[PDB]
A paper describes a structure:
The second crystal structure of the (Sa)EctC protein was solved at a resolution of 2.0 Å and contained four molecules of the protein in the asymmetric unit of which protomer A comprised amino acid Met-1 to Gly-121 and adopts a closed conformation. We therefore cannot exclude that this crystal structure does not represent the fully closed state of the ectoine synthase; consequently, we tentatively termed it the “semi-closed” (Sa)EctC structure. In the “semi-closed” structure, a longer carboxy-terminal tail is visible in the electron density, folding into a small helix (α-II) that closes the active site of the (Sa)EctC protein. The formation of this α-II helix induces a reorientation and shift of a long unstructured loop (as observed in the “open” structure) connecting β4 and β6, resulting in the formation of the stable β-strand β5 as observed in the “semi-closed”state of the (Sa)EctC protein. In the “semi-closed” crystal structure, (Sa)EctC has crystallized as a dimer of dimers within the asymmetric unit. This dimer is composed of two monomers arranged in a head-to-tail orientation and is stabilized via strong interactions mediated by two antiparallel β-strands, β-strand β1 (sequence 1MIVRN5) from monomer A and β-strand β8 from monomer B (sequence 82GVMYAL87). In the “semi-closed” structure of (Sa)EctC, each of the four monomers in the asymmetric unit contains a relative strong electron density positioned within the cupin barrel. Only the refinement of Fe2+ resulted in a visibly improved electron density, however with a low degree of occupancy. This possible iron molecule is bound via interactions with Glu-57, Tyr-85 and His-93. Since both the refinement and the distance did not clearly identify an iron molecule, we decided to conservatively place a water molecule at this position. However, in the “semi-closed” (Sa)EctC structure where the carboxy-terminal loop is largely resolved, a long stretched electron density feature was detected in the predicted active site of the enzyme; it remained visible after crystallographic refinement.
Residue numbers in the entry:
A (entry chain B): 1 to 113
B (entry chain A): 1 to 121
Write the structure that this text describes.
Amino acid sequence: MIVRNLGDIRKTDRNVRSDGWASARMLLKDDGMGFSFHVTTLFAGSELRMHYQNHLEAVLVLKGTGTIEDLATGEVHALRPGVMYALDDHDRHIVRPETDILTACVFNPPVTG
Amino acid sequence: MIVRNLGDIRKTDRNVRSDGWASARMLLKDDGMGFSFHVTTLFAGSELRMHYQNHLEAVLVLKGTGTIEDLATGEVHALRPGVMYALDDHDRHIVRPETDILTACVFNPPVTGREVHDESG
């Protein structure tokens, strides 16, 4: 049984920070679950151009609002709590957070990092 | 790209109900991600005794408080928002929600039919 908590994780090197986002890795490849599990913050007013060549991702919006754009079609979908999007086709997409957006993210294969 | 909505799903047959909990299936086996993805309410006052022989489950607590007990040792861990537990050893465990607890759950392999529903309380 593994038990961790966000507060403690954000005080370690399993919390990664970058330009436009921060991600707290609750689980990584080493934990052996066969997926990684992340709590990722997307910063208000960012333009996050994303594309996961090497993973499938699922994202559940926990807090905040914005939009995600599917570049295959240009369709824009609203993001609000309870919206779930899955990048099943290694989709190129663009997230524009209006407020900060808090997400729970699942990656397969696991981020191993 | 798949885009779903928790609030719409809660109104459908994909919101699975048992004594002690109501679990929304957001991602299904057939979505081909290699895991299933759920939002589950565990009801205040419950005692949920669970053990998955054939699935690894990770759980992030989104709202509410209670405890989880690891029955290998009897250790009791606090559940509150931000706590993540992973059942990496097919652990036998007991969740006791103080208030309603809301979770985001991941199963590997994906949940399908009825095996983890029955293994849950």
